[model samples]
Target: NERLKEKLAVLPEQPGCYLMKDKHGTVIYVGKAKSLKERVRSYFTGTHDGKTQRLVEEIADFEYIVTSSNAEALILEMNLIKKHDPKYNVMLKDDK
Candidate 1:
């Protein structure tokens, strides 16, 4: 996908939560990363579980929100998932 490549190339090495969406612009997955570039890039670079594979299959586009700290990023991610209620994020768990 040309669009995926374009975004991947420009992804910053910053802390953020990346939101993956499907063709209809519906958010499918929401995940936070220490480095946006590495985490987002991982989805396309390696093999994942069935659930993750399913999520990736529907990813048409993605967007991200950068944060100052890991805590901030985690909080923001929690809030985002609450607001968007993405299908693939429903079952995710954190140590907190």
Candidate 2:
């Protein structure tokens, strides 16, 4: 948890896509945020309900890619979700 804390401290206040990984180093979730610092911090500091709570519980580590704009972040996040097929991102998996 301390490792994550250190990473969190340096998170940039910019648009980005973040990936949450489990203990096994598998990505369980991917999301885009207008402010990486605020969004990522919320997952750790506040209470979440339903699926979000479950997603948070399995997160062992996280990584992010800063984007030039929120729209870019959104596009990158969609591509990442398709590429990673992360467990917690269920909304994008049913296009078939």
The candidate that wins on lDDT is 2
Across 1-96, the per-residue lDDT of candidate 1 in tens digits comes to 897799999999999899999999998888999999999999987798776788888889999999998889899999899999999876544422
The TM-score values for the models, in the order shown, are: 0.91, 0.91
lDDT of each: 0.88, 0.90
User: Residue 76 lDDT in model 2?
Assistant: 99
Worst 10 residues of 2 by lDDT: 87-96
> Residues 22-65, candidate 2, lDDT per residue (tens digit)?
99999899999999999999999868766678888888999999
Give candidate 1's error at residue 13 in angstroms. 0.7
Q: Which number leads on TM-score?
A: 2
